[PDB]
Amino acid sequence: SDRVRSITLGNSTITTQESANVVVGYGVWPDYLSDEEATAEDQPTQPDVATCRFYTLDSVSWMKESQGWWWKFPDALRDMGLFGQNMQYHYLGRSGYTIHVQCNASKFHQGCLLVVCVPEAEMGAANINEKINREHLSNGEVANTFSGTKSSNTNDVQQAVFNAGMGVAVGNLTIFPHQWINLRTNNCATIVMPYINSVPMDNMFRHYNFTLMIIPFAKLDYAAGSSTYIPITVTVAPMCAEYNGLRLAGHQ
Amino acid sequence: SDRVRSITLGNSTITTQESANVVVGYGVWPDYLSDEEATAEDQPTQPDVATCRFYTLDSVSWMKESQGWWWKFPDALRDMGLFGQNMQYHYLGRSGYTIHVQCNASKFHQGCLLVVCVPEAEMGAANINEKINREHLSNGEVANTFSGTKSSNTNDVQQAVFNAGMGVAVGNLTIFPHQWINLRTNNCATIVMPYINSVPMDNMFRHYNFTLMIIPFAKLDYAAGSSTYIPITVTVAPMCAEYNGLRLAGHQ
Amino acid sequence: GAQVSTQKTGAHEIHYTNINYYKDAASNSANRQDFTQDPGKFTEPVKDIMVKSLPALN
Amino acid sequence: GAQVSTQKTGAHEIHYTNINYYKDAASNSANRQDFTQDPGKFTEPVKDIMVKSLPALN
Amino acid sequence: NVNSLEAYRIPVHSVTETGAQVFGFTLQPGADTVMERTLLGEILNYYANWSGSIKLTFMYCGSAMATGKFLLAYSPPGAGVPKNRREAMLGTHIIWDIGLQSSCVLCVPWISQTHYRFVSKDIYTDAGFITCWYQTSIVVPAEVQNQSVILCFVSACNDFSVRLLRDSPFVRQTAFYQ
Amino acid sequence: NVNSLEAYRIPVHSVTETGAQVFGFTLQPGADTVMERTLLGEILNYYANWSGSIKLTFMYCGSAMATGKFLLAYSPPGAGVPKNRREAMLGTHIIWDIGLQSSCVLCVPWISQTHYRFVSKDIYTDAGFITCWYQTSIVVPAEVQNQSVILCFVSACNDFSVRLLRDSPFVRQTAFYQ
Amino acid sequence: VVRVADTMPSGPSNSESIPALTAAETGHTSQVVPSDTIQTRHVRNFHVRSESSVENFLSRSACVYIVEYKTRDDTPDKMYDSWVINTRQVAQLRRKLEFFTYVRFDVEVTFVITSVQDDSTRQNTDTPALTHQIMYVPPGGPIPQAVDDYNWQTSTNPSVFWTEGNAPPRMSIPFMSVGNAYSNFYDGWSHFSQTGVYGFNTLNNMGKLYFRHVNDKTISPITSKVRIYFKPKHVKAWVPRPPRLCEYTHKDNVDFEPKGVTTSRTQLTISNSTH
Amino acid sequence: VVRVADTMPSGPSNSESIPALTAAETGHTSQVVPSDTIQTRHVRNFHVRSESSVENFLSRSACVYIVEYKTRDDTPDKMYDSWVINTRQVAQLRRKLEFFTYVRFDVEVTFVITSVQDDSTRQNTDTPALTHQIMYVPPGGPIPQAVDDYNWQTSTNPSVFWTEGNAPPRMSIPFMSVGNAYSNFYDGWSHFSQTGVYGFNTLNNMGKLYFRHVNDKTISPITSKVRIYFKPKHVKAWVPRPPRLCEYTHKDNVDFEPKGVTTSRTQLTISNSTH
C-alpha cells in the first residue's frame, strides 16, 4: 500500500508506516535559482550534503488542555550545524524545506492535529501600541505556545487559538499547504515547501520566511489506564540551499 | 615581460609586478580525489568559493638581527572563515595550497630570504627527554621565531637557524619546493603546494601537513637614512578543499 | 614458466634464467635492474618553463 | 607437467610455477586461492523472496 | 543482567517530556563490551584489521496498539559524545516510525581515514558512537501495558572485509582436558 | 662561524687596488671540509667512486644599485694553487658581470686521467682548485651599504655517476637508543 | 580474483520505496546498502575476501598434545608413551574447528622433538645422537607393552624415524573417516536402547600413536618431549554454529559451568563523561 | 640499459645567448652542460647510473637490534627476551631510511644466533644441540610471561625453529602498513585535542618478537645472543629531505643537541702554503 513512505536527504533517512501523502507546496518542487531570475553577480555556495539534511527540533508535550505551537523557520535552524554556520557567514540565503512532524498513539487514543505551513505570518501584539520582543516571536528550536483565552502579557504576541496570532479565522487557515494528523489513521505529516519571497534571495536573520503551526482541533482524550505522555516531534530538512555574499560572522 | 603575475582565487586577487616565477610542488597541480584512490564511502563537501580563497596572516617585522620564522599549515587557518569552520565540523580534510609571501624594499636596501615549504617538519625539543607544548609548535596566524644560538627553554622547540628545528643542515633545506626573495630582483614568492600524505584524507587538527619557513640568509642591511620598518606578509589560499564525515563542532 | 633476461655486463666487450618458486610476490628477489629516472620534478619544478638561452627573468 | 598461475598481488600496481611430485592427492599443497562465496543460503533463506523496496510483509 | 536473558531487552516506555537518550555504545565490533561476544564480534576477534559497513536492525516487540518514534543516530569522532537530541541529529540518523513493519535498519556508513581499522582499541582508528533518542513518546491506549522491549541486531554489509589472522583473546586454558 | 648562519655568507666589498682573492677551496665533493655536509657531499659520502661534471652557482645578494665583476676560475692540478689573478686566468674561468640576472654558473668540466675519482683523499686522483678573484671592484653610490654577501650553490650535471657502496663516515653511535 | 561490492552513487529521494523498513521476523537478513538510506558517492573498492576463506582460516599448524618419555627408568612404562588421537585437548584448535558441525580435510602432521638431560650424579657423559620412533597404529592393531617389545617392528603399521638435529618430521594423511565428514558433534547414544555414552566419543575411533627411543638403556636419564602439530588442508565445511562462550572442562563430553553473556557496563547510556 | 648523457662538441661563440646567466631565485636548478661555456670535444660516455637507484641503495641487510637470553636462571624473565619492532635503534639503517618521508617495501628478515657457555664451576658438560624459537606476535595478541608458558604454542602466530649449526633462518614479509606507505616522519599528535605523544611513535604499531630456548633447564648456563637483520626489498620512496646533521639520542622522538654545520678551516682563501 501507499501508506509506507521513505525519504532520504543526505546521511539521514525517515521511514514511516502510517503516512498519508506528501503535499508539495503550490505544486512547485524546490530547485536552484536560474540565471534569468538572478540579481547578485558572484558565485554562490552549494554544500548539498553538509547542509541539505534532516535536523530534529525539540519535542513538545501534548496534554488534554494543549492549545497550539509555532516555530519561525529561517530562525529555528540558527544553531543547527553547517546550515546555521552558513547562515552566519553569508549575507543572502535561499532554500526550500521538508517539514516532517511525528506523533504516535495507540488505537485507543483520539485526537486530531492540523499542521500548517504559513508564509509571512506577521503576528499581532498583546498590547496594541506596544513593541514585541524577538524572544516571543521566535525562540529557536524551542516552541512558543498559544493560549486558550485573550492573553495580555508585556511585549508578547496576542496568544489566542481562534485568531492564530494573525487576526483571522483559524478555520480558514487551510488555504496554506497543510496536512492533518488524525490519530486513528495517521502517524505523520510531510510538507515539502519551496522558496516563497518577493525577492530572489534574502537575509536569513532579518527576515522570517514562514511559520509552522500545529493546532489541535479535536482535543486529546484517552481512558483511565492508557499512556499519558504523548510527544510531538518536528524534523526539518533544507532543500537546494545556496548562499551568497561571504563576510565575517555576526548579525548586526 | 614575465615579471608581472596575477592570481585570482574566489573574490580575492593578487597583482604583483616584480615576481620571479611560480613553483608548482613536485610538478603536480592540486586536484580533487578520484574514486580509485578513495577510502570513505559518503559524499564529500566542495564549497569551492567560500573556502578556496586567499587568507592573510599576520605581518612580521624584519630587523637586522632577525633569524627566521615558521607556521604550521593546516593549523594556522583554524580561525579563518568557512575554511576553519569546515575544519571544525568535519572529520576528514584534504586540500592543496597557494602560498604567496610579500616583502618590499627600495633599490638601496639589501637582503635575501629563503621561503621553504617543508612536508612533515617534525621538530625537536629544547630539552631532549621533555614534551613540547602545542603553543610552541604552532600559534595559529602568529609566527614562531628561531634563535641565533642554542635555545634551552622549557617545553619548547630547539630554536637554532643552523639546524632548522629538525637537526639537518639548513643549507641542504632546498630539496623542498622553495623560492628566494632577493631584494634587488624580487618582491614576492609564490609556491603552489599539492596534497602530500601517506593516506588519502586526514584530520586537520591532529595532523600537521607542512611548515612554511622564511629564513634570511643574507642579513637585512641599509644606510643611516633609509626606512627601518620592513614587514613580511604571508597570504594563503586553499585549493580543491573537500571535507568528509560531518559531526558536531569540536576537537577532542 | 621460465624468464630469460640479460646480465649486467660492462661496455666495449649473459642471459640468466629465473623461475619463481613461491605463491606470493613478497618472496621474489630484488628488482635491481630498473635504471630509469626523471629529475623534472626536482630540477625545473616551475610553471612557464625556461629555455636556457633566453635571459629567463628577462 | 607444469602448471602456471598468477600470484597474490595488490591492486593499482607474478606467474609462479608448480609441479606435483607425489602419486597421491593428499600430498598436494593447500588450495589457498578459492575466493568465491554465496551467502544466499544463510541470508535470504526463505520461500517467496523479498524485493527490498516493497513493504515485504505488506 | 548478563547472567540472564534480560541483557537483550532494551527497556522503553512512555516518557514525561521528550527527547531523552534510550541507549548508547561505541562502534567497536570486537573491542566494545556490547558487541564483543556477538557473531560479528567473534569472527572479528579472530582478525586484527576490519573494513566495511555495518547494519543495525531494531525490532519493536511491544503491542499492536502502541505507537512511537525514535532517532537512530551515528556520529563520527572528532568531537565527543552528543549530549542531547540537538547534537545527535547533526550526524547520520534516521527517524523510525513504528507501524505494521516491525523493524528498521540503521546502515552505518563506512567513513574512515584509512582503508582498515583495528579490531583492538587504539586512539588512531576510532570509529564513532551509536546512540538512540526519543523523537516522540510511546502513546498507548487504556488497559495495555506501557513498558515495552526493543531488540537489536547486527551484521555486516556486502563490502565488508577482515585482513590479519591472530589468536582470539577469549581462549584461556591452564592444563589439558583429561 | 659554523655555529651560526654566517658560514654561508661570502663577504665582499669595495677594495683598495684590485685583483685580490675572494675565497678558495679544493674540488673534493666528499673530502673537502667546504662541501662535506652539502647534499652532493652526503650522497657522495655514501659512495667511494665518483665521475662527471659539477655546477657551481653564485648568487649576488647585495643592492640593486651596486655593480661588480669577478673571475671564477678552475685550475687542474699538476702545478699548485694560483697565487694571483695572472696565474688564475690561465685555466678554465668565466668573467661574471653583476646586473639584472643575479646568478652565474661556473660549470666545472670533467678533466681526469681515469674515468672515476675517489671520494676519500688520495694523491693519485686529485682534482684541482676552485678560486675567485676581483676582476673589478664593487662600485656603489652614496647612502648605500658597501659590504655585501655572495651565496654559493653546488649540484651535479647530467653526466654524473657514483659507483661503490660503503658506510658513511659520519654515523658514530656508542650504545643503543633506548 | 573476486572483489567486494562497489558503492554506487545516489541522490535525494522522496517516494513510497522503503529499503530501511523490513521484517526480521521472517528469518531474513536485510540486504540494505548504504546507498539506500543516505547520499553516497561512487567508490571503486578493491578489497578481496581472501584471508577469511575456510581454507585460509583453518590451514595453520596447531599443537594438539605434548608427549613425554624417558630413556632409562626403573619402571618400563615411563620409557615410552602413547596418545589416543583427538583434536579436543587444546582449546584453540578445538574452538577453531567447532565453528562447523561437519568437516572434510586432509591432515599434515609435524613432530617437534626436544631432549633434556635429567638431573643425576653422573651428568659428565658423551652421549651419541638419539634416534626416536613414532609408530601409528590403526584401530584394532596390537599394542606394544614395553620398549623392547616385538610389536615395534612396523611391518604393516606406518612409522617414522628421526635423528636428532634434523628438520622436524612431516607426513601427509588423507581423509580417514568411515562416513562422509568428520562429525564434530554427535547428538546421540552408542547403544540402540539409548544407553551407553552420550556425545562424539563414539565417533572418534582414529587410532593412537606410540613413542620410544630406538637406542637402548643409556647410562644417564634424558627426558624427551615431542609436540604434535596438525594442519588441516583441503578443507570443506558445512552447517555453521555459534562459537562457544564457556570454558571447556573435559575432552570426552561438552559439559560446562554457566558463563555470563558478555562483560558488564554498569550503565546503559553513553556520555562525554568518564566512559 | 640507460646511459648517461654524451658530451657534444662545440666551437667559439659570440652572441646574445647566455646559458651561464640565470636566476636561482625561481627555485630552478640550471641545466648548464659544459658544452655551453667552454669548447668541448665529442665524448661517447658509457657510464650507467646503476648502483645509485633506490632499490640498490637500500636493499642491503642491516643489524637492527641484539637480543640476549639465557637457558637457566633464578629469575624467569632473563630466560627469554622480547623486542618491540622498530628500525630506529641503530643509526645506519635509520639514517639510510630517513632520506625520504614515505616508503613502501617488503622485508626480508634474517636471524644470526650464537651461544656462549657462561662461567660456572661445572663447565665440563656434554650439552646436546640447542634449539631456539622466534615467535612473532601481531599487535593485540597474547603475551608469554614465562618460558614454560602456554602462549608459546603458535597455533596462529608465525614462528620459526632453528637447530644450532645450520644456515641462518630467513623469511619474507610483505608490506604491512594500514596506510599507503610506511611514514618515516609523522608531524602530529595522537589525541584530537593536540595532546598525548608527538612524533612517529603513534604510527609504529608493528608487533613484537619473542625469543626462548625450546630445550628445558640445562645443568649449566649458556647465553644466547641473536641478531636481527632487515633487508628492504621491492622499494618505492617519495618526497626526499636532507640527511641528518646531528647525532641521535632516542628511538621515540627526533630531539637533539645543536651541531655545527661543517668542519672549520680557520682561513677562507687557499694558497700554495701549508693548506
Ligand SMILES: CCCCCCCCCCCCC/C=C/[C@H](O)[C@H](N)CO
Ligand atoms: C607416524 C605416521 C602417521 C602419523 C599419524 C598421526 C595422526 C593420524 C590420524 C590423522 C589425524 C586425524 C585427526 C582428527 C581429525 C578430526 O578433526 C577429528 N576426527 C574431529 O573432527
Ligand SMILES: CCCCCCCCCCCCC/C=C/[C@H](O)[C@H](N)CO
Ligand atoms: C618469526 C617470523 C616473522 C618474523 C617477524 C619479523 C619482523 C616483522 C615486522 C616486519 C618488519 C617491518 C619493520 C618496519 C618497517 C618500516 O621501516 C618502519 N615501519 C618505519 O619505516
